[PDB]
Amino acid sequence: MDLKVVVSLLYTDEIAKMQQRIGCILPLASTHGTQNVQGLGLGQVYSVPDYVSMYNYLSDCTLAVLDEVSVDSLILTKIVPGQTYAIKNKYQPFFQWHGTGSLSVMPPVFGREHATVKLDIVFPMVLPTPIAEEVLQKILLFNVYSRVVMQAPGNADMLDVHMHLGSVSYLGHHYELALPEVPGPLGLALLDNLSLYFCIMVTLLPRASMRLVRGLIRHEHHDLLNLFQEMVPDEIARIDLDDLSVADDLSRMRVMMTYLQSLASLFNLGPRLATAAYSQETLTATCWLR
Amino acid sequence: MDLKVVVSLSSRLYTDEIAKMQQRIGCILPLASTHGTQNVQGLGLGQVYSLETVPDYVSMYNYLSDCTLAVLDEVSVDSLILTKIVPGQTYAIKNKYQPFFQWHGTGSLSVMPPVFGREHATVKLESNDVDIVFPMVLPTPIAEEVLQKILLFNVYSRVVVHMHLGSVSYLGHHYELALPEVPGPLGLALLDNLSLYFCIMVTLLPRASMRLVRGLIRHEHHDLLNLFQEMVPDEIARIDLDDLSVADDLSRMRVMMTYLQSLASLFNLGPRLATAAYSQETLTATCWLR
Amino acid sequence: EVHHEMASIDTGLSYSSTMTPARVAAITTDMGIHTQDFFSVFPAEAFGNQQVNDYIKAKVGAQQATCEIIVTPVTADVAYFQKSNSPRGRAACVVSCENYNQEVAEGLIYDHSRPDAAYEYRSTVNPWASQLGSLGDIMYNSSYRQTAVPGLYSPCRAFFNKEELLRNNRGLYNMVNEYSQRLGGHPATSNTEVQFVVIAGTDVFLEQPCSFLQEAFPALSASSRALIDEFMSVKQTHAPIHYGHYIIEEVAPVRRILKFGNKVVF
Amino acid sequence: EVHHEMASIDTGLSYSSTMTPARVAAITTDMGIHTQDFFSVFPAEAFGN
Amino acid sequence: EGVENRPFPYLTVDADLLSNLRQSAAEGLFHSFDLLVGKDAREAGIKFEVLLGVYTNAIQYVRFLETALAVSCVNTEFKDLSRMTDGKIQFRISVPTIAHQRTFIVVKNCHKHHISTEMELSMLDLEILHSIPETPVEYAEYVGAVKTVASALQFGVDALERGLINTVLSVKLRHAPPMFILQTLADPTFTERGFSKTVKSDLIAMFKRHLLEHSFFLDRAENMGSGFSQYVRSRLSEMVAAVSGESVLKGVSTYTTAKGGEPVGGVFIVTDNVLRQLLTFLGEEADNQIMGPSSYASFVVRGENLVTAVSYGRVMRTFEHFMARAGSTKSDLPAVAAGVEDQPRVPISAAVIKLGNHAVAVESLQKMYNDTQSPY
Amino acid sequence: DPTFTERGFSKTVKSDLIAMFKRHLLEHSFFLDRAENMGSGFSQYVRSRLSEMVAAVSGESVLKGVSTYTTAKGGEPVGGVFIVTDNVLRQLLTFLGEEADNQIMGPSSYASFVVRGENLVTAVSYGRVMRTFEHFMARIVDSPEKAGSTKSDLPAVAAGVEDQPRVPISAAVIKLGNHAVAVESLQKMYNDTQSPY
Amino acid sequence: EGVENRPFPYLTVDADLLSNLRQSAAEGLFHSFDLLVGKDAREAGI
Amino acid sequence: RRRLQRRIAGLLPPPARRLNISRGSEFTRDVRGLVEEHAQASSLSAAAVWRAGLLAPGEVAVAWSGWRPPVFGDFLIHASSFNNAEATGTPLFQFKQSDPFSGVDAVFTPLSLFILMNHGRGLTRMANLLYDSPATLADLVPDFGRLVADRRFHNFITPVGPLVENIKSTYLNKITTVVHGPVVSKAIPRSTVKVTVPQEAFVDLDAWLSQPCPADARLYVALTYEEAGPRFTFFQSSRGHCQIMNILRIYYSPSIMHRYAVVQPLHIEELTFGAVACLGTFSATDGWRRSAFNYRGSSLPVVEIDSFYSNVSDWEVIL
Known part of the structure; x- marks a missing residue:
């Protein structure tokens, strides 16, 4: 079937900087024939940065590995889950790939100036799954550990959070x-609200856990494990409050449920690509949408 | 590939039942088998959802993941035809559902047991003395909201705020x-697995994020923080008395993100539909099974 | 897959096909005694004390054709049980009720101010299975059989349910051609160890006149071995009613030879 | 991906093909003194202090 | 150890392969060899396994008109049943009166029946089918592949033409009330009144009386002594006469007795043992052949019907007859015989008996159902 | 009888079949003693029981399309043969009245199946002989696309048995409804050798 | 099992071989048989 | 605009989804054009290449139909680490090696995956009969004891799907495996391939419970962490992933409290009770016909899933 998407719009430096990236991918706005310039990858979402809406835009709209760049046109092919493709790891944070490892696509967290081409075009980061969850944990806890030492410098040391992140x-x-050594407080950075999601669900998890365990134990015995796993937490978080406004507790449970579901869908790494035969000689990888 | 399942009614059909079924053309219906022709028993969600007072939603989910899915296109007297939904094909699914949920552009649809009543989404077939009910198809965030509202009414049943939930x-x-009163052993088994997940969350949850949010409630006020009513919970006080360490935090987050993916898959009950290019003027969407 | 359609339509007005029974291959059911416990059918009910409930459940042995029990007083006439009648002690004839109504139907079926349909001179045989709230319907009528284990086929239920009787209160031709074209009157199984209820159509092949007619044909019961062994000996002059014992001739549609030693009877 | 199958089978009983070496061309290893070290071959082995 | 010795005709080359053998045979030059010394070094006894012929069943195709079930049903090849959403028939029954006026307009509707099995073919014998063979082993493979595919497709249409008989036999059961009811219902001595209460109670008394005295008549006929033939005839005759055959297609000549102008007028569908017992209790039958049609009828849509069809559907059965519109029976006799005539009147191998003035056919389909391993 | 063996032999079918074995064993076995004390209708009873024995035999032999062993006077195929003892032979003659025939035609010599040159080569090298090498060559390497019908391969299922001369064979023939079976007792072949029949 | 699944010039006879066959073969009247249902019901490769 | 009609005539007609046959005996050219699927292998001539239509773009067409062509994973392994007496259709498991550049990967059959679990502490007889020495396998995983100890063995082994081609090289074996798509063998007589899983490691889950019968019954591989060393079980189910983690938690309900009772999880990483992964779908009707696998000496029972559509997934943890 036909698969090309010809987006119409360059000069010699633009020709060079686009010809370097003839195997990378970028999202689109539509799965149609001809598109404008604005419908290209991550232009309208990365210029204040925020990871959750960028992930929603990356999972919502389609994806497209580009093939050729003319003086005025960019012939590119959208990727559909039907057939298979070929991609390259030509990204400024360079991570060496491997065979039959699942590839993920995350919005660019290592700086706008690293993954872009200034004519605008912003390419998303393509990097394998265990490195993806690893760097996601290591930027989340970096935001938390930088914010606590911007709050209270005696809590943690700046060198102690830097040998492991x-x-x-x-x-x-x-x-x-x-890592941004100067994030600036009150949000306003990248991953500035996802840590603000993580702390709220971590905060509201004990209030959910006590209400949920006490709510199920009067449902006498469906299994052992409603009462078997009561011994594994600490006893301090077991007997915490047990008296609160039922409307306020209901809103706290509902807020932690939606912040748990959105964060759980986000910690699932996104549109997962499944490679088959990576070759570091040619820097190519046979992949498909999974 | 030919996907056409003709379901021969074993009796006739009056004109009022014909005119009632003809309004529900394009709505998703489940089937018993995947074969060529079928009888009318096993069609719809009515064999698990009997004409009783007591529902059980998770058993209807376990039915829906087990059975196949089809779309209703032609209904005649004595026989109505259906078009199966097999993964790999791309379908046009119209929005012919009476509680009108507006659909997102290239979002994700999600099938559902009838949460807005038996009599609302049904057709009464006295002629073949059975009942065909129609599973609700709503977008995935509102589906998560409905599912968590059902579970929240299941846990708050021994407490009481009702119309707020x-x-x-x-x-x-x-x-x-x-709102039913008891889901029997299956909804309680789902709550059992989610209780395992929540209790192991409040085991392995990190402490530096609590140290962030305790000072942050004292520092900043936000819509992520208004639900605490400017009162840090006592568990934050009796956990944040310990110090902060980045190595055990990175050890904790490597199990946190490991468990949150499986917790996300603990809400994928009922098959999920991945849609694209929903037009708000014709109420149909080019959608395929995910 | 090779689809094929065909559309048939009747050309005559009245009936144009008859299906008779002709032979008997074998009585598959092994017509013997096998009662079903109400503990398996009503598991949720129990007595006050736990251990007396356990003693009862272990003593009756609570844990093949399915029998039932209709509890009757000992003043029921044996001349009733000789003739083939309805086992709930009332002549449950549906066409001496009027068609497509309820009041005279319930009057003939459950009201006892009028006498029996068969006998002009008494109400019923037992008042423990022919009343609106008796013992027979508290066992078997589906209005009080709620939250029972489905798939057990209490065979006495076919005499006691209301919707079958209100189905039989329709027109007669409507009744017979809806018996013929709709066999799904909640029947038994075909080839099973214990009789469940089938739910699938055009797979099993069975038809019941019991849901059509609501009578039963009495089997060879006897209150001693002596009446059996004298009914085997003489046939035209056996004793129907002895001093305190009784034997019951079979007027069943099937006719079995009773090979006892070498003394048959047919 | 082309494919081609051949089935060779000997038809003589004894050995039917010999292979001498004729001449040297080069000695690629220097016949020298670079002994291997058991610190690289047995790296887990260590002493007390 | 991996080598046979049959008395081969050995080709005698002159190679010097004797030299340095047993020295090399002991060391293990060969992977597999068996030294034969003494008496054993001989051309061995010729022995063989014999394959005494392969066999298979020639699956006979069973045409729906090749059995006598098609005497029950007049057939028409309607090429567009997928586009037939409905089919109805009006009956204006003019009822006369008796001086010591009613017309009962009744409607009957058709009811479709969708049947389909599922043959399965591998992707091996399609990729080898579409390709062209070159070597004779590939031609011997390609012939087996096309025989597999043609046999599967012929099996598919055979299963369809058997499921047609199954659906006919089922829909002839769905409109078939039992015998003990229609023994009384066809007797006009009890429909004389207008079906009041007491006559209905009398009829449900007669149902119970006929249930335990007339059912299982073949089991009654063994203890009747010599009067089995007359009893079987006197039961089957009233079985036939209790069936009202007042059908509008009765007047045309579909099936005759293959010897004269005696129309058949009914068919008996029994099992194997019942057929083998009835062909001795009635003794010798009349004939072994029945004249009947060799194909279906035909009903296509001409433009005078097609403009109505593409206008609003609702086609007519005979638009030329409606364009013609007095009429009598002999006038409208081709209007009802809508293609059921002019068929070449082939004989059909099916048994036919004579019950008084009715020449009823009798046949058993277990031969058709037991080749499907299904329950009759 | 196909009535029981059509559902699929569950545990509730063999329980019926064993009881029916017992009920046929207590009643219908030794059918030349109940036919002695029957009285008048001995002929109908014996003629019923022999036909019940004949029709309960699977006559789906693959060589039944080959027309061999017809009856001499009629010309109808003799499908079946009774082997009885000599004392019951005259009893079965008198209970069935009289023989419908006195002799049957049949093959005068055995079918000749010797190995041909192609068979010998397949017998020498591989040690495997086929039945009809000419038919295998005719249906693989002479006309493979020409499929086989029951008329086109009725010569192949009849390896010379249909071309062998027909002499009469003396045996008592009876009639059971439509069929004809040959009732024969070869007890006289045993008693002059004193071997146990 | 000694059954050979090879292709063959299968001689077609007309006798009703499959008279109560599946319930016979599932119970094991034959000493060695093979049931091929679906995609294995073809001729094998040479 | 008249060349547009020729282009659309070249583009329009799909393969026929329906075809009115009259008899099966005639075998018309129309139904042959329906039932024929273009091949994948032909002889090396212009006529055979043009007749099979290999050169058509995207999908095969002589000079889209719901079929997807498979993809092949090419793996180089040591000849000692694999047994060349393996069956064709057996699912393998690539272990992610910890060196930056390897060249040679490391795959494991579930027979070979058994002897990594056995040592340190029927099926095991055949497993020790195939591979003589576990130490030539237990160094492919360099630190097996630590990786099992901190419960990070599931994320370092990814499934790869069944094997199709195994050339019998002498030092460095190259095997081919289908990581995604229709599993079909690449042999010049195209013969089918059956996914073989040994019987004691393959416990059914439909019959373990004992009416809506679906078509695609998935096959789940399941690594669990036991006190007797980890185990690699295989589960066949006809249900969803949402159903499969719930019913696998219910199936492993004695084993979790077994591992808890014998060993207290003193740290935070010992909580994970392994993970599962969907290996792909197959037909629920003629699934999992039992067969046998014969070595030279012995024979173990082995299931034979036929016509497998391999589709791996990421690891979903069990807890």
């Missing part, structure tokens, strides 16, 4: 990360 | 939904 390690590839 | 609220309209 300034580097990731997968399969012996010991990479490094670009 | 027993009514879904959408931008088109807010709707009431039918």
Whole structure:
């Protein structure tokens, strides 16, 4: 079937900087024939950065590996879950790929200037799944540990949070990360509200846990494990409050449920690509949408 | 590939039942088998949802994941035809559901047991003395809201705030939904697995994020923080007395994100439909099974 | 897959096909005694004390054709049980009720101010299975059989349910052609160890006149071995009613030879 | 992906093909003194202090 | 150890392969060899396994008109039943009176029956089917593949033409009340009144009286001594006469007795043992053949019907007859015989008996159902 | 009888079949003693029981399309043969009245199946002989697309048995409804050798 | 099992071989048989 | 605009979904054009290539139909680490090696995956008969004891689907496996391939419970963590993933309290009771016909799933 998407719009430096990236991907706005310039990847969502809406835009709209770049046109092919494709790891945070490892697509967290081409075009980060969850944990806890020492400098030390978050390690590839040493308080950064989601669900999890365990134990015995796993938590978080406004407790349970579901869908790494035969000689990878 | 299942009624059909069924053309219906022709028993969700007072929603989910799915296109006297939904094909699914949920552009649809009543989504077939009910098809966020409202009424049943929980609220309209009293052993088994998940969450949850939010409630006020009513919970006080350590936090988050993916898949009950290019003027959407 | 359609339509007005029974292959049911416990059918009910309930449940042995029990006083006439009648002690004839109504139907079926349809001179045989709130319907009528284990086929239920009787209160031709075209009158099984209820159509093949007629044909009961062994000996002059014992001739539609030693009877 | 199958089978009883070496061309290893070290071959083995 | 010795005709080459053998045979030069010394070094005894012929059943196609069930049903090849949403028949029955006026307009509707099995073919014998064979082993493979595909397709249409007989036999059961009811219901001595209460109670008394005295008549006929033939005839004759055959297609000549102008007028569908017992209790039958049609009728849509069809549907059965519109029976006799005539009147191998003035056919389909391993 | 063996042999079918074995064993066995004390209708009873024995035999032999062993006077195929003892033979003659025939035609010599040159080569090398090498060659390497019908391969199922001369064979023939079976007692072949019949 | 699944010039006879066959073969009247249902019901490759 | 009609005539007609046959005996060219699927292998001539239609773009067409062509995973393994007497259709497991550049991967059959669990502590007789020495396998995983100890063995082994091609090289074996799509063998006589899982490691889950019968019954592989070393079980089910984690928690309900009772999870990482992964779908009717696998010495029972559509998934943890 026909699969090309010809977007119409360059000069020699733009020709060069687009010809470097003839195997990378970018999302679109429509699965149609001809598109405008604005419908290309991540232009309208990354210019204040925020990870949750960028992930919603990356999972919502379709995806497209581009093939060729003319003086005025960009012939690109959208990817459909039917057949298979071929992609390359030509991204400024360079992570070496491997065979039959699931590939993910995350919005660019390592700086706008790293993954972009200024004519605008913003390409999303393509990098494998265990490195993806690893760097997601290591930027989440970096935001939390930077915000607590911007709050109280005696809680943690800046060098102590940097020997374990300034580097990731997968399969012996010991990479490094670009962390914003000056995030600036009150949000206003990338991953500024996802940590603000993580703390709220961590806060409201005991209030959910006591109400949920006490609510199920009078349902006498469906299994052992409603009362078997009462011994594994600490006894301090077991007997915490047990008296609160039922409307306020209801709103707290509902807020933690929606913030748990959105964060749980987000911690599922997104549109997962399944590669088959990566070759580091040619820097190519046979993949498909999964 | 030919997907056409003709269901021969074993008796005739009056004109009022014909005119009632003819309004529900394009709505999703489940089937017993996947073969060529079928009888009318096993069609619809009515064999598990009997004409009783007591419902059980999770058993209807276990039915819906087990059975196949089809769309109703032609209904005649003595026989009505259906078009199966097999993964790999792409279908046009019209929005012919009476509680009108507006559909997102390229969002995700989700099938559902009838939460807005038996009599609301049904056709009474006295001629073949059976009942065909129609499963609700609503978008995935509102489906998650309905599912968590059902579970929240299941846990708050031994406490009582009712109409603040027993009514879904959408931008088109807010709707009431039918609230049962007990889901039997299956809904309690779902709550058992979710209780395991929640209790192991409050085991392995990190403490630096609580140290963030305790000072942050004292620092900042937000719509993520207004539900605490500027009162840090006592569990934050009696857990944050310990110090902060980044190594055990990275050890905790490597099980947190490991468990949250499976917790996300603990809400994928009922098959899910991945849609694209929903037109709001013809109320149909080019959608395929996910 | 090879689809094929065909559309048939009748050309005559009245009936144009008859299905008779002709032979008997074998009586598959092994017509013997096998009662079903109400503990398996009503599991949720129990007595006051736990251990007396356990003693009862272990003593009756609570844990093949299914029998039932209709509880009757000992003053029921044996001349009633000789003739083939309805086992609930009332002549449950539906056409001496009027058609497509309820009041005279319930009057003939359950009201006892009028006498029996068969006998002009008494109300019923037992008042424990022919009343609106008796013992027979508190066992078997489906209005009080709620939250019972489905799939057990209490065979006495076919005499006691109301919707079958209100189905039989329709027109006669409507009744017979809806018996013929709709066999789903909640019947028994075909080839099983214990009789469940089938739910599938055009797979099993069975038809019941009991849901049509509401009578039963009495089997060879006897209150001693002596009446059996004298009914085997002489046939035209056996004793129907002895001093305190009684034997009951079979007027069943099937006719079995009773091979006792070498003394048959047919 | 082309494919081609061949089935060779000997028809002589004894050995039917010999292979001498004719001449040297080069000695690629220097016949020298670079002993291997058991610190690389047995790296887990260590002493007390 | 992996080598046979049958008395082969050995080709005698002159190679010097004797040299340095047993020295090399002991070391293990060969993977597999068996030294034969003494008496054993001989051309061995010729022995063989014999394959005494392969066999298979020639699956006979059973045409619906090749059995006598088609005497029950007049057939028309309607090529567009997928586009037939409904079919109805009006009956204006003019009822006369008796001086010491009613017309009962009744409607009967058709009811479709969708049947379909599922044959299955592998992807091996399609990829090898579409390709072209070159070597004779691939031609011997391609022939087996096309025989597999043609046999599966012929099996599919055979299962369809058997499921047609199954649906006919089922719909002839769905409109068939039992014998003990129609023994009394066809006797006009009890429909004389107008079906009041007491005559209905008398009829449900007669149902019970006929249930335990007239059912299982073949089990009654063994203890009647010599009067089995007259009893079987006197039961089957009233079985026939209790069936009202007042059908509007009765007047045309569909099936005759294959010897004269005696129309058949009914068919008996029994099992195997019942047929083998009735062909001795009635003794020798009349004939072994029945004249009947060799194909279906035909009913296509001409443009005078097609403009109505594409206008609002609702076609007519005979638009030329309606374009013609007095009429009598002999006038409208081709209006009802709508293609059931002019068929070449082939004989059909099916048994036919004579019950008084009715030449009823009798046949058993277990031969058709037991080749499907299904319950009759 | 196909009535019981059509559902699929559950545990509630063999319980019926064992009881029916017992009920046929207590009653219908030794059918030449009940036919002695029957009285008048001995002929109908014996003629019923022999036909019940004949029709309960699976006559689906693959060589039944081959017309062999017809009756001499009529010309109808003799499908079936009774082997009885000599004392019951004259009893079965008198209970069935009289023989419908006195002799049957049949093959005068055995079918000749010797190995041909192609069969011998397949017998020498691989040690495997087929039945009809000419038919295998005719249905693989001579006309493979020409499929086989029951008329086109009735010569192949009859390996010379249909071309062998017909002599009469003396045996008592009776009539059971439509069929004809040959009733024969070869007890006289045993008693002059004193071997146990 | 000694059954050979090879292709063959299968001689077609007309006798009703499958008279109560599946209930016979499932109970094991034959010493060695093979049931091929669906995609295995073809001729095998040479 | 008249060339547009020729282009659309080349583009319009799909393969026929319905075809009015009259008899099966005639075998018309129309129904042959329906039932014929273009092949994948032909001889190396212009006529055979043009007749099979291999050169058509995207999908095969002589000079889209619901069929997807498979993809093949190419793996290089040591000849000692694999047994060349393996069956064709057996599901393998690539272990992610911890070196930055390897070249040679490491795959495991579930027979070979058994002897990594056995040592340190029927099926095991055949497993020790195939591979003589576990130490030539237990160094492919360099730190097996630590990786089992901190319960991170599920994320380092990813499934790869069944094997199709195994060339019998002498030092470095190259095997081919179908990581996604219709599993069909690449042999010049195209013969089918059956996914073989050993019987004691394959416990059914439909019959373990003992009416709506679906078509696609999935096959789930399940790593669990036991006190007797981890185990690799295989589960066939006709249900959803949402159903499969609930019913697998219910199936492992004695084993979790077994591992809890013998060993207290003193740290935070020992809580995970392994994970599961969907290996793909197959037909629920003629699934899992039992067969046998014969080595030279012995024979174990082995299930034979026929016509498998391999589709791996990520690991969903059991708890």
